[PDB]
Short mmCIF file of all heavy atoms in Angstrom, two decimals:
data_model
loop_
_atom_site.label_atom_id
_atom_site.label_comp_id
_atom_site.label_asym_id
_atom_site.label_seq_id
_atom_site.Cartn_x
_atom_site.Cartn_y
_atom_site.Cartn_z
N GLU A 1 0.77 -1.11 -0.03
CA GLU A 1 -0.04 0.01 -0.07
C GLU A 1 0.82 1.22 -0.07
O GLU A 1 0.60 2.16 -0.83
CB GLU A 1 -0.94 -0.05 1.26
CG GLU A 1 -1.80 1.12 1.34
CD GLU A 1 -2.72 1.12 2.56
OE1 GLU A 1 -2.63 0.02 3.29
OE2 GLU A 1 -3.50 2.03 2.83
N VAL A 2 1.83 1.33 0.85
CA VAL A 2 2.66 2.51 0.92
C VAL A 2 3.70 2.68 -0.13
O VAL A 2 4.02 3.82 -0.62
CB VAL A 2 3.35 2.65 2.32
CG1 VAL A 2 4.32 1.59 2.59
CG2 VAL A 2 3.87 4.01 2.57
N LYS A 3 4.30 1.53 -0.55
CA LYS A 3 5.33 1.70 -1.57
C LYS A 3 4.83 2.07 -2.88
O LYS A 3 3.62 1.85 -3.23
CB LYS A 3 6.05 0.24 -1.74
CG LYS A 3 5.26 -0.74 -2.31
CD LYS A 3 5.95 -2.05 -2.41
CE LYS A 3 5.14 -3.18 -2.99
NZ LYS A 3 4.83 -2.97 -4.51
N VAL A 4 5.66 2.83 -3.59
CA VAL A 4 5.45 3.10 -5.15
C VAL A 4 6.64 2.56 -5.79
O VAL A 4 7.75 2.41 -5.32
CB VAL A 4 5.27 4.67 -5.35
CG1 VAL A 4 3.93 5.06 -4.56
CG2 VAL A 4 6.39 5.43 -4.92
N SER A 5 6.38 2.23 -7.15
CA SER A 5 7.51 1.65 -8.01
C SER A 5 8.54 2.67 -8.21
O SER A 5 8.26 3.88 -8.64
CB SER A 5 6.91 1.24 -9.34
OG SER A 5 6.33 2.29 -9.94
N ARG A 6 9.73 2.42 -7.75
CA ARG A 6 10.87 3.29 -7.79
C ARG A 6 11.97 2.64 -8.65
O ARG A 6 12.27 1.52 -8.66
CB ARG A 6 11.50 3.67 -6.37
CG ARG A 6 10.40 4.44 -5.57
CD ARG A 6 10.88 4.76 -4.25
NE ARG A 6 9.91 5.41 -3.41
CZ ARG A 6 8.88 4.83 -2.81
NH1 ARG A 6 8.63 3.50 -2.87
NH2 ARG A 6 8.04 5.52 -2.10
N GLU A 7 12.68 3.53 -9.51
CA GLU A 7 13.28 3.10 -10.71
C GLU A 7 14.63 2.26 -10.25
O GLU A 7 15.17 2.32 -9.23
CB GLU A 7 13.69 4.27 -11.49
CG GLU A 7 12.60 5.07 -12.10
CD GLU A 7 13.00 6.26 -12.92
OE1 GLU A 7 14.30 6.73 -12.79
OE2 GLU A 7 12.21 6.93 -13.56
N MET A 8 15.15 1.59 -11.23
CA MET A 8 16.32 0.99 -11.31
C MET A 8 17.46 1.99 -11.56
O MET A 8 18.65 1.61 -11.70
CB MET A 8 16.53 -0.25 -12.20
CG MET A 8 15.57 -1.40 -11.89
SD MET A 8 15.90 -2.84 -12.91
CE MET A 8 15.06 -2.23 -14.39
N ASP A 9 17.07 3.27 -11.77
CA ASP A 9 17.98 4.29 -12.08
C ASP A 9 19.07 4.36 -11.08
O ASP A 9 18.86 4.24 -9.82
CB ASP A 9 17.20 5.60 -12.12
CG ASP A 9 18.12 6.68 -12.25
OD1 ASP A 9 18.83 6.95 -13.23
OD2 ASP A 9 18.23 7.53 -11.22
N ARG A 10 20.24 4.83 -11.53
CA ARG A 10 21.51 5.22 -10.68
C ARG A 10 21.06 5.93 -9.45
O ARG A 10 21.12 5.32 -8.28
CB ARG A 10 22.46 5.81 -11.53
CG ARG A 10 23.67 6.47 -10.76
CD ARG A 10 24.64 5.45 -10.30
NE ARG A 10 25.84 6.06 -9.75
CZ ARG A 10 26.78 5.45 -9.05
NH1 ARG A 10 26.58 4.16 -8.64
NH2 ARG A 10 27.80 6.08 -8.73
N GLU A 11 20.48 7.11 -9.61
CA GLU A 11 20.24 7.89 -8.41
C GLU A 11 19.01 7.50 -7.70
O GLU A 11 18.95 7.60 -6.46
CB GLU A 11 19.99 9.46 -8.85
CG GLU A 11 21.27 10.07 -9.39
CD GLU A 11 21.69 9.74 -10.74
OE1 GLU A 11 21.01 8.98 -11.38
OE2 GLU A 11 22.79 10.27 -11.21
N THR A 12 18.04 6.81 -8.28
CA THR A 12 16.89 6.26 -7.56
C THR A 12 17.43 5.05 -6.71
O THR A 12 16.98 5.08 -5.57
CB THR A 12 15.76 5.88 -8.56
OG1 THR A 12 15.38 6.95 -9.23
CG2 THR A 12 14.62 5.33 -7.70
N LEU A 13 18.23 4.29 -7.26
CA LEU A 13 19.00 3.33 -6.43
C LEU A 13 19.72 4.13 -5.27
O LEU A 13 19.43 3.85 -4.21
CB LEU A 13 19.98 2.58 -7.34
CG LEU A 13 19.36 1.62 -8.38
CD1 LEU A 13 20.49 1.13 -9.25
CD2 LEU A 13 18.71 0.38 -7.75
N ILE A 14 20.56 5.09 -5.82
CA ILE A 14 21.38 5.81 -4.87
C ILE A 14 20.54 6.37 -3.72
O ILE A 14 20.77 6.31 -2.51
CB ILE A 14 22.00 6.98 -5.59
CG1 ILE A 14 23.24 6.50 -6.44
CG2 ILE A 14 22.43 8.20 -4.70
CD1 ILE A 14 23.97 7.66 -7.07
N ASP A 15 19.31 6.83 -4.03
CA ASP A 15 18.33 7.24 -3.07
C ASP A 15 17.97 6.19 -2.14
O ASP A 15 18.18 6.23 -0.83
CB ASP A 15 17.08 7.88 -3.72
CG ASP A 15 17.37 9.11 -4.40
OD1 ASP A 15 18.32 9.92 -4.18
OD2 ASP A 15 16.47 9.59 -5.26
N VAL A 16 17.40 5.13 -2.66
CA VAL A 16 17.12 3.95 -1.85
C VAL A 16 18.38 3.46 -1.14
O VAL A 16 18.37 3.04 -0.07
CB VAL A 16 16.40 2.85 -2.69
CG1 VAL A 16 16.05 1.64 -1.84
CG2 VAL A 16 15.11 3.44 -3.32
N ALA A 17 19.49 3.42 -1.97
CA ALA A 17 20.83 3.16 -1.38
C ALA A 17 21.08 4.02 -0.15
O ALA A 17 21.09 3.56 1.05
CB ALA A 17 22.01 3.36 -2.39
N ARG A 18 21.13 5.35 -0.30
CA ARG A 18 21.32 6.33 0.70
C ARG A 18 20.39 6.04 1.95
O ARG A 18 20.68 6.44 3.09
CB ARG A 18 21.10 7.73 0.23
CG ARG A 18 21.10 8.86 1.20
CD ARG A 18 20.72 10.08 0.42
NE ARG A 18 19.43 9.92 -0.05
CZ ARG A 18 18.88 10.61 -1.06
NH1 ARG A 18 19.49 11.60 -1.64
NH2 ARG A 18 17.61 10.40 -1.42
N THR A 19 19.26 5.36 1.73
CA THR A 19 18.41 4.98 2.80
C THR A 19 18.79 3.60 3.31
O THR A 19 19.35 3.46 4.51
CB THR A 19 16.94 4.77 2.24
OG1 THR A 19 16.72 5.94 1.42
CG2 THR A 19 16.02 4.69 3.44
N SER A 20 18.71 2.53 2.54
CA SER A 20 18.88 1.19 2.92
C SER A 20 20.23 0.92 3.40
O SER A 20 20.54 0.13 4.44
CB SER A 20 18.39 0.24 1.82
OG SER A 20 17.07 0.30 1.54
N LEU A 21 21.24 1.55 2.73
CA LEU A 21 22.63 1.47 3.21
C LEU A 21 22.67 1.95 4.72
O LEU A 21 23.28 1.29 5.54
CB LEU A 21 23.57 2.41 2.37
CG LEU A 21 23.54 1.95 0.89
CD1 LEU A 21 24.33 3.11 0.19
CD2 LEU A 21 24.36 0.67 0.60
N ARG A 22 22.06 3.08 4.91
CA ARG A 22 22.08 3.65 6.30
C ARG A 22 21.20 2.93 7.21
O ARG A 22 21.51 2.78 8.48
CB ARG A 22 21.70 5.11 6.22
CG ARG A 22 22.67 5.96 5.55
CD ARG A 22 22.22 7.45 5.53
NE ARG A 22 23.14 8.32 4.82
CZ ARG A 22 23.01 9.57 4.48
NH1 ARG A 22 21.90 10.11 5.03
NH2 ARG A 22 23.84 10.20 3.78
N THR A 23 20.20 2.21 6.62
CA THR A 23 19.33 1.30 7.51
C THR A 23 20.15 0.13 7.93
O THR A 23 19.64 -0.69 8.70
CB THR A 23 18.07 0.71 6.79
OG1 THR A 23 18.47 0.02 5.71
CG2 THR A 23 17.34 1.92 6.34
N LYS A 24 21.33 -0.02 7.46
CA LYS A 24 22.38 -0.94 8.00
C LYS A 24 23.30 -0.23 8.86
O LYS A 24 23.35 -0.35 10.07
CB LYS A 24 23.09 -1.78 7.02
CG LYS A 24 22.13 -2.72 6.16
CD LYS A 24 21.53 -3.70 7.05
CE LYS A 24 22.47 -4.81 7.56
NZ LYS A 24 21.87 -5.87 8.31
N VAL A 25 24.23 0.60 8.21
CA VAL A 25 25.36 1.16 8.86
C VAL A 25 25.24 2.68 8.79
O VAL A 25 24.21 3.34 8.42
CB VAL A 25 26.73 0.74 8.19
CG1 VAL A 25 26.88 -0.70 8.28
CG2 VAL A 25 26.60 1.15 6.72
N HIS A 26 26.32 3.51 9.30
CA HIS A 26 26.34 4.88 9.30
C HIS A 26 26.45 5.41 7.92
O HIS A 26 26.83 4.72 6.91
CB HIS A 26 27.57 5.24 10.17
CG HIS A 26 27.60 6.71 10.59
ND1 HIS A 26 26.61 7.39 11.25
CD2 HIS A 26 28.51 7.62 10.28
CE1 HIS A 26 26.85 8.62 11.36
NE2 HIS A 26 28.10 8.86 10.79
N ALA A 27 26.27 6.76 7.81
CA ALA A 27 26.22 7.44 6.52
C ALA A 27 27.43 7.26 5.70
O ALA A 27 27.36 6.64 4.67
CB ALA A 27 25.90 8.88 6.80
N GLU A 28 28.60 7.76 6.27
CA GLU A 28 29.80 8.06 5.59
C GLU A 28 30.19 6.78 4.59
O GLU A 28 30.16 6.76 3.38
CB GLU A 28 31.05 8.31 6.31
CG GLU A 28 32.23 8.46 5.54
CD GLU A 28 33.51 8.63 6.29
OE1 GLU A 28 33.35 8.81 7.66
OE2 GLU A 28 34.60 8.80 5.67
N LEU A 29 30.53 5.59 5.29
CA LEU A 29 30.88 4.39 4.49
C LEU A 29 29.65 3.98 3.65
O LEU A 29 29.78 3.57 2.48
CB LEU A 29 31.30 3.34 5.35
CG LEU A 29 32.68 3.70 6.05
CD1 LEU A 29 32.91 2.63 7.09
CD2 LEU A 29 33.61 3.73 4.98
N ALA A 30 28.49 4.15 4.10
CA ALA A 30 27.27 3.91 3.25
C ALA A 30 27.11 4.98 2.24
O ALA A 30 26.72 4.67 1.09
CB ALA A 30 25.96 3.95 4.17
N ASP A 31 27.60 6.26 2.45
CA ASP A 31 27.62 7.25 1.51
C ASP A 31 28.71 7.07 0.34
O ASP A 31 28.44 7.49 -0.73
CB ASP A 31 27.76 8.68 2.17
CG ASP A 31 26.58 8.94 3.00
OD1 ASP A 31 25.44 8.35 2.89
OD2 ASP A 31 26.68 9.93 3.88
N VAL A 32 29.77 6.40 0.81
CA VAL A 32 30.73 6.08 -0.26
C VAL A 32 30.33 4.76 -0.97
O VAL A 32 30.61 4.32 -2.09
CB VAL A 32 32.08 5.93 0.20
CG1 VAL A 32 32.26 4.90 1.25
CG2 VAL A 32 33.14 5.75 -0.92
N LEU A 33 29.42 3.93 -0.29
CA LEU A 33 28.79 2.84 -0.82
C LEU A 33 27.49 3.18 -1.41
O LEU A 33 26.61 2.35 -1.81
CB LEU A 33 28.42 1.71 0.31
CG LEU A 33 29.77 0.98 0.71
CD1 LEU A 33 29.44 -0.09 1.76
CD2 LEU A 33 30.62 0.27 -0.27
N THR A 34 27.19 4.51 -1.49
CA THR A 34 25.92 4.93 -2.22
C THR A 34 26.25 5.09 -3.78
O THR A 34 25.30 5.40 -4.39
CB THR A 34 25.38 6.20 -1.54
OG1 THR A 34 25.36 6.00 -0.20
CG2 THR A 34 24.08 6.59 -2.06
N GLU A 35 27.55 4.90 -4.03
CA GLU A 35 27.86 5.16 -5.55
C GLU A 35 28.50 3.72 -5.98
O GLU A 35 27.97 3.17 -6.90
CB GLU A 35 28.85 6.28 -5.69
CG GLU A 35 28.38 7.64 -5.20
CD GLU A 35 28.68 7.73 -3.71
OE1 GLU A 35 29.24 6.91 -3.13
OE2 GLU A 35 28.29 8.79 -3.15
N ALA A 36 29.60 3.34 -5.50
CA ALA A 36 30.26 2.22 -5.96
C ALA A 36 29.41 0.93 -5.91
O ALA A 36 29.51 0.10 -6.73
CB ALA A 36 31.64 2.01 -5.20
N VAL A 37 28.51 0.96 -4.86
CA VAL A 37 27.47 -0.05 -4.81
C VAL A 37 26.56 -0.02 -5.92
O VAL A 37 26.26 -1.05 -6.50
CB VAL A 37 26.75 -0.12 -3.35
CG1 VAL A 37 25.62 -0.85 -3.42
CG2 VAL A 37 27.78 -0.68 -2.26
N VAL A 38 25.89 1.13 -6.09
CA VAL A 38 24.88 1.14 -7.04
C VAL A 38 25.27 0.84 -8.34
O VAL A 38 24.53 0.29 -9.16
CB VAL A 38 24.33 2.75 -7.03
CG1 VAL A 38 23.33 2.87 -8.16
CG2 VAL A 38 23.71 2.96 -5.68
N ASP A 39 26.56 0.98 -8.72
CA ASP A 39 27.14 0.59 -9.96
C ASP A 39 27.17 -0.90 -10.05
O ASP A 39 26.82 -1.50 -11.08
CB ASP A 39 28.57 1.11 -10.13
CG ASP A 39 28.49 2.61 -10.45
OD1 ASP A 39 27.40 3.15 -10.85
OD2 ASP A 39 29.63 3.18 -10.41
#
């Protein structure tokens, strides 16, 4: 109900990354894993 379809796009991933990465660990390493991971 709450979710909406969100793209496989780099930044849309990055967005969900910037979230879900941090829903594991702290920002910085997740924030450097917000790019190299999404690739």
Side-chain angles (χ1 to χ4, degrees):
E1 179 180 1
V2 67
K3 66 184 181 67
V4 297
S5 63
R6 294 177 181 82
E7 295 176 351
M8 295 184 286
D9 171 66
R10 174 66 171 166
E11 289 80 359
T12 300
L13 295 170
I14 286 182
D15 291 343
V16 180
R18 176 186 58 200
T19 317
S20 294
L21 301 169
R22 294 182 183 173
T23 66
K24 295 300 284 188
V25 295
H26 188 65
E28 177 182 1
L29 293 175
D31 290 346
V32 66
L33 292 177
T34 307
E35 302 88 359
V37 163
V38 172
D39 288 344

